[PDB]
Paper text:
The allosteric regulation of ADP–glucose pyrophosphorylase is critical for the biosynthesis of glycogen in bacteria and starch in plants. The enzyme from Agrobacterium tumefaciens is activated by fructose 6‐phosphate (Fru6P) and pyruvate (Pyr). The Pyr site has been recently found, but the site where Fru6P binds has remained unknown.
We hypothesize that a sulfate ion previously found in the crystal structure reveals a part of the regulatory site mimicking the presence of the phosphoryl moiety of the activator Fru6P. Ser72 interacts with this sulfate ion and, if the hypothesis is correct, Ser72 would affect the interaction with Fru6P and activation of the enzyme. By X‐ray crystallography, we found that when Ser72 was replaced by Asp or Glu side chain carboxylates protruded into the sulfate‐binding pocket. They would present a strong steric and electrostatic hindrance to the phosphoryl moiety of Fru6P, while being remote from the Pyr site. In agreement, we found that Fru6P could not activate or bind to S72E or S72D mutants, whereas Pyr was still an effective activator. These mutants also blocked the binding of the inhibitor AMP.
Author numbering:
A (entry chain C), B (entry chain D), C (entry chain A), D (entry chain B): 6 to 420
């Protein structure tokens, strides 16, 4: 009768460096990266835990975490322990530690068992903090207890050619994991649906007591790189019972989302695409869904403003999404996403632009196919997107032609 | 040495019905009317008290107060008594009286004395809750203390011809009030500067013990209409000492505000004018000023979205202010201010439009010079601002061509 | 799979005057009556709904409810609509109704249908807000959906002689209600257990749309006194399907509670008894339980302090419960419960005393078997509990010897 | 005109080890040590800034301050940047720096200049976060700007023999500092009263721009140990102007505090004494003063409970302070201070005991003249305070007879 989320703790691995996002993550961990206009990536998993009814959340942090920790401290500040709610921020440090960082994703939980055991949750819900997706974890929890599994693993149903870039679960007709393979050149297909392979999401459910014993034996193992995907999980698939849970079963799909939505935004192109796709008439991700809302940190902000309408300048946005506290003053916006605080000045033009918070666009600048980092001041008259070899020498530029622009890159300019 | 605001409490009168605002205040008192894109009228006085350092606030309410009380409960909820802050909502009901409503502005303070005296503030700052202005009440506090006045009155400096519609304080050369005239045909000028008269703002400062003793005499006097402006203050001007405080000395002007800003928005024209002027390139009210911020009730909302760009339709805003959670779908906005949550659909057009929260504009509608009430659903193809005689018959149309449109007006059409 | 409480709105009936509490409810509704040392009575129903996972709460109050509304504003202020939470305070008022009073328990919901319908909850959980008990409403929701009932009713299983003051359900083989009798002088008994009767808790579960329709039918019928127990429920017992849910199946019992706990505290004796029993070594109600906590309004308070220890006076408490902000200054406390903020001075003695917040006990006063109302100042040397005839003349005194003491009574006296 | 606290940023140095508190700070920084029954030491300085009107607070901690940072996250969480409030937690780390450690008190501010300067405060109020005192910083701000000093230094007026442990400021008739000597064996006195000497409170006021330039002067000097007391303060007395502000002018004294109160509880003796003194009839520190309240992290806790009263046992507290969620089960308490959550079981005795949160006293245990660490479980029948030689063998014992007891010592115990 009782929901099992009542007795579960969500534990979010938020130590991801996000290496292939390059300078976008030079001073932030990937879970702290802005997404979608107002939120950060970490907010999806946290909101899934919230919307699912989980009232104890732990977040393990690591690489360049001040920015993530501060966002966590003020967006996620409303859990009250007297109501059996908790939100613990757990950066690798010198606690019982006194040895720098976490040795791996399993160590990120092991080091904080002293936090978990007093709460005594019945179930642990391990989550990757660096993906955008909406999911109701109570489905996973019921499957796990109904199946008698030692671990239940969330998996996407992906066409097997696309599955080559994934950790792939080899499943029988009972959906038991009979093998796990890192990045198979030929991914094992699902029995009876061999065009698709199951791609591990990095979402794991255990009984808390089993997991604590498993972490402890892993910690005593010198062989171990102290990682779920490489050490913990392969052990269970061999000598224990590992079961696959299908994202399509638990994904929360608004009526305006044509398929289960999940994005890794692991490269600059992917990050640009997922943000820019929110400018579509019918986006893949419905940021207007009220049924499974995404909480994040937000401030009371003034509204967006458009000024100037003369022969030579008009402030306007077309096929764009514009956040609060944006002043579009004689600037022409097309197919662009502006986060909070942006200032675009007269005669500047933006096309195919992902513009992070508090950016300033100087007069006469013209930019196409760009990601502009937080707080960048674009100088007057700057042109991006016209000359590929000039843009490549000045900025981080993808093969497909997207330019990521940081303040340090601007600072090095006078051509 | 100590700032006097520590020992002051603000008392806001928010029973004002907004009569000449007509259907706009049929379902909500004037202080609860929306202004500027996000806030409500009452948030200005409240934010003034907060920014000036006043830690105790009471608000007297009366006429259709549910919206007002719901706004105060949800937005002004962060005061903690252990920190010697308080925020009291004081409607009229079955208190220590128990039958009817408040008898007047002074009665609205006298009925709730049992709440004031336990706080024992040294100063009462009496404020009207139905005007838009920014004021640092610390200046008025120290003038009252240093003047020995029984009451210090906030007064606007106004060219005499426009002072004919105000309560006007006839003042001497020490700025002491020697008479008070309700709407003088030829308002007495300021001595030595006879082009200007002093218009009462309805802002009154007292020592608390004097105010209580004065409120009790008024309550005893069965001939009193139980009002500040017409009973109490006319007595102190005669037998006591009343001193005027000039708005210009304490007004908080942004760098981008060309003069002290104060608006009553008492008419549909004044209300339309004050909102629409926020679409100016240089507005008189700088709503982006961060040095004296206006607090209000706000929720996390999605950003604003502009969509469709073909030969028949383009979603976009020009010379316009658009709040969050607005979707401009193939609609063309110009010189318009949209509060939060508006949906404007394909082929619709808005010009000189003040659009309150949650409005839906049907496809192909075209509206010019309008105030659209909260929640109104505009039917497909509706035209306003083309035929004055038809517009006047369907809705409330001002002397100047502004149409106020309410849901009940929309229900009556189709005949 | 999904918890039923996700789709429910708890609607708390908090209009009840509790007239048999006499002077205890003269200046506050019964749901605002303090209980247990910190909380108020309404806090149990509200905490039950919170702990059961219901995210939408409405509370119906009267207009004699300034105390109750202030408590809900300050204490139940942490719901955010963006997270699909809502807390609605619904007093009887002139919203779109003109009249300022609710006709009865059914009308208290009918008048606010315009609030419930936009939320569109799948289920309504109607609760009486004037009882002390702990209950997991998810059980009742699951029974209501699986039984197909038109209304499920929460029922205490009690000996039939004590069922004589309740509304009682006669019920068949499968716990379906075949008849409802109001205070039967000889109540019907359960099949296979005709020694016990099922007495109505005033807790009702409906499918939301059924309830709205039934609430509309009832508002039309002028025979109806506008009540759930008198009108709505008996209607459906006859014409529809009513099923009883037994409190023993969903009561939340701490390990230190020997049976399911529900109390009415409808008489002064019962109120006194329920509070004083908390000073037992093993109380019936475990207020130290963390698994089902009671949320309330609380402030940071200084600790309790006991002072003086000479031949004449000792400040200490024996077999007693003492709250924060309490100074027991040379006073002797035995089997007494002190709410927050009490001051008891030298040579005073309290025994069997339920002492509400902010009470002051003057020196040399001696009080026995009393309930002392909020804020009462006891004069030095007052004796209560030694002279039955004189206590009776001077205070509210029960048949059992408990004296209720209000400030009104204290003032009336020199003898 | 305006209070100067509006333009001030309080900057709290909270890195101190508190080494001569020994095992009491083995895993907590000194500012995070509990004091008074509920608050922690850092809360006083923080509350001073809040009650003084300062709205921007910075707190420098030394990296692995997990208990301190968690305290600030949960307790000091109510500052909203949209209202120009800010509360920043700044641990020594690697964001724009990389040193892993703050090289001194000056370096603790220097490293976070990039946080301070965007706020553009006009004044900096540098505070030591490891002392217990109540002070209104507005008085010190007025004097700093009225006197034109470069630095203004808070100082206590103390007898010279007791000043030998402090940084001492030699004064003149104008209270201008002529020299600063660290720990003078024979301290200079003050003109007109040479029985006393000015001891540095470690509180400094600067004009923000002077301080920034000063911090940049210091960093570029390899001679400097990057310390406020060692380097920057003496620099200015010699070359610039430094002026003494005397605590007695700005200390916030209750009606019941017989002299300005300040403790640095640097020893175990001092810590014990300052806490046990709150058990007095007339304590030096009035923890019941509601006019300069101490804000802290707190939860809704159950009341305190005293149970059992036969000839074998009696649970009671005499001349003691007992916090919430304390259960005194058949335990004898006298002149003891109990923090929240303490459980004392039958036949146990506490005397001259300072008992930190969540301690469990086993049955038959009898402890005298102790400080018991957070969360310690006292074994059944343990005796402390009867054998000085044995107690010294098992615990940390001061010369004066005070035993400090941690769980580690308890675990090492057979005899």
């Amino acid at each position: 009768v009782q929901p099992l989320a009542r007795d579960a703790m969500a534990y979010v691995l938020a130590g991801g460096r996000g290496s292939r996002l390059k300078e976008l993550t030079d001073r932030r961990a990937k879970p702290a990266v802005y997404f979608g206009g107002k939120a950060r990536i970490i907010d999806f998993a946290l909101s899934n835990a919230l919307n699912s009814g989980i009232r104890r959340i732990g977040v393990a942090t690591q690489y360049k975490a001040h920015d993530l920790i501060r966002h966590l401290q003020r967006g996620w500040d409303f859990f009250r322990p007297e109501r059996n709610e908790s939100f613990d921020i757990l950066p690798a440090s010198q606690r019982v530690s006194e040895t720098q960082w976490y040795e791996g994703t399993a160590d990120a939980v092991y080091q904080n068992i002293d936090i978990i055991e007093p709460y005594a949750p019945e179930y642990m819900v391990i989550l990757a903090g660096d993906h955008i997706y909406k999911m109701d974890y109570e489905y996973m929890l019921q499957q796990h207890v109904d199946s008698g599994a030692d671990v239940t693993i969330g998996c996407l149903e992906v066409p097997r050619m696309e599955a080559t870039g994934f950790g792939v679960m080899h499943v029988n007709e009972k959906d038991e994991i009979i093998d796990f393979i890192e990045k198979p050149a030929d991914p094992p297909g699902i029995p009876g649906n061999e065009g698709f392979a199951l791609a591990s999401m990095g979402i794991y459910v255990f009984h808390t007591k089993f997991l604590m014993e498993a972490l402890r034996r892993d910690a005593a193992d010198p062989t171990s790189s102290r990682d779920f995907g490489k050490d913990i999980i392969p052990y269970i698939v061999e000598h224990g019972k590992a079961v696959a849970h299908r994202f399509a079963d638990s994904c929360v799909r608004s009526d305006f989302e044509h398929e289960p939505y999940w994005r890794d935004v692991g490269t600059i192109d992917a990050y640009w695409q997922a943000n820019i796709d929110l400018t579509d008439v019918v986006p893949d991700l419905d940021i207007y869904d009220k049924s499974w809302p995404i909480w994040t940190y937000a401030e009371i902000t003034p509204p967006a403003k458009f000024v100037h309408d003369d022969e030579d300048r008009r402030g306007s946005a077309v096929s764009s999404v514009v956040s609060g506290d944006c002043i579009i003053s004689g600037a022409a916006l097309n197919r662009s996403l502006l986060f909070t605080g942006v200032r675009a000045n007269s005669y500047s033009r933006l096309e195919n632009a992902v513009v992070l918070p508090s950016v300033k666009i100087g007069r006469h600048a013209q930019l196409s196919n760009v990601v502009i980092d937080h707080g960048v001041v674009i100088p007057e008259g700057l042109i991006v997107g016209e000359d590929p070899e000039l843009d490549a020498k000045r900025f981080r530029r993808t093969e497909s032609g997207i330019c990521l622009i940081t303040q340090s890159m601007i600072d090095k300019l006078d051509l």
